[PDB]
Design an enzyme around this catalytic site. Structure first.
Site, PDB file in Angstrom:
ATOM      1  N   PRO A  66       0.829  -1.184   0.000  1.00 59.88           N
ATOM      2  CA  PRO A  66       0.000   0.000   0.000  1.00 59.88           C
ATOM      3  C   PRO A  66       0.883   1.261   0.000  1.00 59.88           C
ATOM      4  CG  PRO A  66      -0.699  -1.520   1.743  1.00 59.88           C
ATOM      5  CD  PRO A  66       0.627  -1.999   1.214  1.00 59.88           C
ATOM      6  N   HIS A  67       0.482   2.241  -0.785  1.00 58.38           N
ATOM      7  CA  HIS A  67       1.235   3.474  -0.927  1.00 58.38           C
ATOM      8  C   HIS A  67       0.361   4.489  -1.648  1.00 58.38           C
ATOM      9  CE1 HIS A  67       1.697   1.787  -4.842  1.00 58.38           C
ATOM     10  NE2 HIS A  67       1.935   3.021  -5.259  1.00 58.38           N
ATOM     11  N   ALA A  68       0.752   5.757  -1.587  1.00 58.15           N
ATOM     12  CA  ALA A  68       0.154   6.794  -2.386  1.00 58.15           C
ATOM     13  C   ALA A  68       1.282   7.784  -2.741  1.00 58.15           C
ATOM     14  CB  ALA A  68      -1.056   7.455  -1.706  1.00 58.15           C
TER      15      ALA A  68
END
Lengths: 148, 148
Positions: A66-68
């Protein structure tokens, strides 16, 4: 030498059960919100992308990253790692269930590239992935990460 | 062999100058708009990120890796490589002037990680980085890429 420095005990979680994908992500990101590495809105950006776009951050069997974006609230280079011993469905097709989550947060591309380069090696090392997918304690995890 | 496969004659450019960073981004992305790998708006997404937080995608002295999210207009995993021989200011502090731009576009994290892992190796090879910074023709670029 990066993973060993970034993934200390304070950002490593082993939980038996997550309610759902959102809980799995939240579990993983709460230490980074708490220590100031990311703003709370970073996790929100992750959720919103999951809901609108889909789980494209699931990178292989059992593994999510998960990342942004840097602009979505990253304050400093940071990682967190959670193992969900029961697995959690992300509706990521054959990659489900997800058991390992490594959250990435970077402010720029130099640090992103370095972190990803190391994570690529980890994800390509089946014995280390096996040891993490099967981890029961933070020490199981720390023992793997000690080689990075 | 990703880099040598993807970075073929049709997606590599040497030009002497651009108007400014925006125009450098435009030149660098145009082959991927032309061939349908990305939508035109991918360029506008890069501009807006830079407007929000600065040139985070400038990797180090002379080198930029412009990119945005899958949802910002990516159709297919793609790279494009441009050398702007007179350089361009990105307002990237000590990393300016930028001469080498490698645009990255990916639709998911598995492909993103693979591409980054290959680009990390290029960027970690000072002899090849210098050869690209010195490049005057497309043949000069392919000779470097032939080692990837």
């Amino acid at each position: 030498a990066m993973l060993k420095t970034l993934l200390t005990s304070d950002v490593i979680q082993v939980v038996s059960q997550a309610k759902d994908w959102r809980d799995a992500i939240a579990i993983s990101c709460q230490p980074l919100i708490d220590n100031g590495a990311v703003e709370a809105r970073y996790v929100e950006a992750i959720y919103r992308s999951h809901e609108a776009i889909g789980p494209y951050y699931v990178v292989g069997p059992g593994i999510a990253m998960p990342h942004a974006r840097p602009e979505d609230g990253v304050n400093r280079l940071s990682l967190a790692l959670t193992v969900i011993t029961e697995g959690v469905t992300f509706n990521a097709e054959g990659n489900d269930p997800v058991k390992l989550l490594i959250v990435l947060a970077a402010t720029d591309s130099n640090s992103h590239i370095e972190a990803i380069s190391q994570l690529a090696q980890l994800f390509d090392t089946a014995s280390d992935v096996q040891a993490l997918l099967n981890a029961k304690t933070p020490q199981d995890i720390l023992s793997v990460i000690a080689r990075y």
